[PDB]
Amino acid sequence: NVFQPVDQLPEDLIPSSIQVLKFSGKYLKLEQDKAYFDWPGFKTAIDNYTGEDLSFDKYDQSTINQQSQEVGAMVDKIAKFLHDAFAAVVDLSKLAAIILNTFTNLEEESSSGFLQFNTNNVKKNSSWEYRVLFSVPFAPSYFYSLVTTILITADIEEKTGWWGLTSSTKKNFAVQIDALELVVKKGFKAP
């Protein structure tokens, strides 16, 4: 999948959540053998959505300049931003665990369709975009879907330099967080 699905939904809503994943996947842009989420395109599609089973709640973003810090500290900042803004959808502890485990297990998850690695030859650094979609219960025919992307950049030159990171590993890390909250109704189908 283009986004890693993370959800606590009853069976009757799973089909609709799958449609939300399908919907989001149409905005993945592949160029130069690299796949990145197309936020402008997706936001416009939501703005111009003439349906009746999908509603736009809010969209939050944060760009944090490079700071020398431990992986764990960085994950906590990401979790704080999302938890502060979407407390009804995310549990602080669990969210932090999910992000931390992803970035400390990149070697195994590298080939996943929801992660994209890249290097900047000039600056000699590198980055990973992590795409995750959280869905939780809102009638019980509604649920929240939080379309999320986390781009972490670090002063690591090669892809292999990301293997075996631990919560204590310190690097000059920068982060870009994007999260769009949707209210979806059972029966929703990707346009």
CA 179/CA 62 separation, integer angstroms: 9
Q: What is the CATH number of the domain that holds 43?
A: 3.40.198.10
Range of the domain at 148: 1-191
Question: Would you give the distance in Å from CA 91 to the centre of its chain?
Answer: 15
Choose among 67, 99, 66: nearest CA to 179: 99
CA 28/CA 39 separation, integer angstroms: 9
**Segment (H or E) for 25:** helix 14-25
CA 34/CA 28 separation, integer angstroms: 10
Give the sign of the dihedral formed by CA 105, CA 108, CA 113, CA 117. positive
CA 145/CA 173 separation, integer angstroms: 28
CA 169/CA 64 separation, integer angstroms: 18
Q: How many domains does one find in the chain?
A: 1
The letter for the amino acid at 18 is I
- CA atoms lying within 13 Å on the CB side of residue 140: 7
User: 129 near 150, Cβ under 8 Å?
Assistant: yes
Helix axes 71-85, 92-103, angle to 10 degrees: 140
In angstroms and rounded to an integer, the radius of gyration of the C-alpha atoms of the chain is: 17
Per-residue DSSP letter, 11: G
CB 167: neighbour CB atoms within 10 A? 16
- Tell me how far apart the terminal alpha carbons of the chain are, to the nearest angstrom: 18
C-alpha distances out from residue 103 to 27, 100, 144, Å:
24, 5, 25
CA 152/CA 69 separation, integer angstroms: 12
